[PDB]
Design a protein around this ligand. Sequence first.
Ligand SMILES: Nc1nc2c(ncn2[C@@H]2O[C@H](COP(=O)(O)OP(=O)(O)O)[C@@H](O)[C@H]2O)c(=O)[nH]1
Lengths: 38, 61, 666, 141
Amino acid sequence: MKVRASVKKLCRNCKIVKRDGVIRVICSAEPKHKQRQG
Amino acid sequence: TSYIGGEGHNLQEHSVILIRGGRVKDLPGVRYHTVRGALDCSGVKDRKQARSKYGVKRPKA
Amino acid sequence: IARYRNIGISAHIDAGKTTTTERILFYTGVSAATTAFWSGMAKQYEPHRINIIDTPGHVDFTIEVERSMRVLDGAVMVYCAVGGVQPQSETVWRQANKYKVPRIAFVNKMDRMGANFLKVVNQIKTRLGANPVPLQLAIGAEEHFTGVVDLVKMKAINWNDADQGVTFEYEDIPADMVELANEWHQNLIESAAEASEELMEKYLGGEELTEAEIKGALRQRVLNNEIILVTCGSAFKNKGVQAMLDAVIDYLPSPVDVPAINGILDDGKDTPAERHASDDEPFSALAFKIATDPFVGNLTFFRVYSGVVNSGDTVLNSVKAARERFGRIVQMHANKREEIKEVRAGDIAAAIGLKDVTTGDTLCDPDAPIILERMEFPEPVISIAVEPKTKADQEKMGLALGRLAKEDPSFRVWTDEESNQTIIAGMGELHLDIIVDRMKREFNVEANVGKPQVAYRETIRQKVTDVEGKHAKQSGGRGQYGHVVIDMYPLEPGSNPKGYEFINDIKGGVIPGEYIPAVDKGIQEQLKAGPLAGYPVVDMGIRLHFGSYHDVDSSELAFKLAASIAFKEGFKKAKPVLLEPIMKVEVETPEENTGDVIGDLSRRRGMLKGQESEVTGVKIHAEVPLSEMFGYATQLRSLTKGRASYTMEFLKYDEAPSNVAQAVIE
Amino acid sequence: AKKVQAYVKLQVAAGMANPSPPVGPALGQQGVNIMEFCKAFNAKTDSIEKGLPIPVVITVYADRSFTFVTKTPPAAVLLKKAAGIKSGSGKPNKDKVGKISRAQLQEIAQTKAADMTGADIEAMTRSIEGTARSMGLVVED
RNA sequence: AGCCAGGAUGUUGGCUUAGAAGCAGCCAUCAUUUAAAGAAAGCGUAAUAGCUCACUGGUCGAGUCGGCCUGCGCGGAAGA
Ligand SMILES: Nc1nc2c(ncn2[C@@H]2O[C@H](COP(=O)(O)OP(=O)(O)O)[C@@H](O)[C@H]2O)c(=O)[nH]1
């Protein structure tokens, strides 16, 4: 859950979403890509 | 202090030894000696004479 | 002779072993050589003396198991119903098949939740490669287990248990479970006819077998190692304990029913002669344990195999060549040291006060030639040094490790001639500290342990040529004038026998020749005392071109002093570097460890040097520096289900990095 | 063609029996134990010639059948004996590291035309031309 | 863009062959038929397999896909 100030995709399954205003990135290849704020 | 007069050595820095009497007249300070053949100190191998000293264990036949 | 029973209850940690043993001891009435009694239907209910060899708990320290295996004639292999067979269960199986000693399998934890008998049986066949035989079967589930059905005698026993599980009742198999449990009734008649074809005729003839004949079938296969027997059990809630010994008295051999040893000799035409199972043969025994009692003395255990001893005879123990004598022989009932003067062939005894009895001495009472046995061959895996809090308390534990290197053959010691402290050695983490604890509580030496130092050699690299050393210390009447211009090499590693070479290279008549060997001996004093780290130096071949001398200043002590003043600069000008002692390690990690172990090895700065695959073993060899090698096998057993090990040998050296040069500090 | 039932695609080093040093543990970790293989392998390798490399097309399975298909040596190691230079480099385009005439490639791949089936003769040698020119041993017609 | 079906690789292509066997890194980066297909984009294997992408082949059945420049907001953004 990286609270980094910039999210960018690292896998190819990564998607950038819009949940509750806060921009987020998930990935289901290595669920270590999950982050916020970017 | 002691003296291990002889041409072998094994002992270690932290072994237990034995002490007998014997002076030197080369070393001011020594007045004892080692006892080889006895406890955890090995005697000199293949010194056939004076075998009651130095513990050579009678080279076979 | 037919009545005695030398049994060993060997088991994995937490299997039930200690709790099983207590149910043996509590039943049979109504240390390492506990005795017992029982009366068996297989031998017409005459009394039978069980001599329970206490098997070592930590089977990790494999040597103590190996001694234990030989002295036991039978063995109960305790297992866990929920967990199946275990890593150390396969480990103790290795020691057992090595000495050919047959077993019986004991499924404990039947009361525990998740207990299936069939689990273990499958686990028996799959991993260990055995052909198991189900003797009895649980009536009901984990909580509902009350019944034991001996399918060989085709009877049943239950337990409401009513007084600690001792009194029992006769039943038959209830209707809900006859048909599915009779599959293994069908398993019994087919696995009992290949040893004698007379039982093959009854199967293809239609004759259902009676009780005593099938024992004649099954016992011989647990005499010649073909099939094993698997009995159910539960010690902690005591259901299946009466027939547990009635598994041992019906199947396992006795001191007459074991093959006599095919041991080697040491005289004459070096032919194998026997130590027969006759009670009136010329005696020989084998001492296995040494314990100092609280207040009985120095117990000198041994097993009584064959012959008669009237106690108080001399012994011709021809592995040390010394004649000792006896105090008594002791056998314990619970640990009850009730005395005895009669040494019956097939019993086990614990003699007292014999001075120089080691572990593994083959002793002879009527002074006959021995049946020589040499069996101390596991090797400890750790080289860890000590630090006792007083040097007078150090040689007392150096006497206690000098006792512990005299009681247990692989917990040896390493006398360090070179580094002021000694090394305790073991095969495992826990066996090291339990002897640290035993010398903490019993022998009373507390230890703030420290890790050892490393051998730490050096080498140089630059091709320096000129470097000289002058010493014109005249100053008085008789002084010292030396001048020996030296030269050296980044020498070849392993072609020459010794790591340094020397050669006369005088141009004219500029030095007296007699000093020229003495210069080499002075460098021979000044090689191994390096000014870098106080650690000895190797790998340079020094040549010597130019020189000078004098008439009145010709002490040869000068021609060894300034040769070091030439080597004070000469060390300083070829940019040297320490050499790390590199090991040569090999490790067999069977199949599901390879990704872990090679990842473990590469983190320990080793290089990939290939592998093979013998039938199950993927054995990887490598070369590894000795810097951070404190505890490799503990790091290896953690990631390998504690199965694999390692045995190494120091071979070579290599270029050390600067962090090992950061370990210079002084 | 199978992928994995007892299949390996290796074991071209046929300079010596018991091929444990060059190939080794891949044979022993994938089911095919060497105790019946090498006892049967010199019933099929001595039939042709020795001193050659061999691609084993092993049509074997779980119920102990060593049915054996063999092929012309692979184009990586065919030229070890066919060129006669013992130089397999890694810089094809940077430097000329050996010499082949293309008619020498014809007669050593007219065996490949008899053994392997790509399409037809000059196209089947054309399939080998880029494999040969991937090493540095260049071909000069 | 999805649903069913291949992933069209001869080949373990050199090296350092100890494993780098499309996927360590450096070179080449050919040719099968070239309807889809690179001797290779990725997770993943000690080493393979395996999971899939390239390409939607058939189906479905209308626009859809990646950037350049600007208007305006969002995250970036915690003090008694
Ligand atoms: N539920 C259950 N627990 C058991 C059984 N046998 C032993 N235990 C438990 O296992 C624990 C350790 O067993 P132990 O005899 O010390 O095994 P050992 O270390 O190999 O000697 C004890 O606390 C017992 O309570 C059993 O049959 N059922």
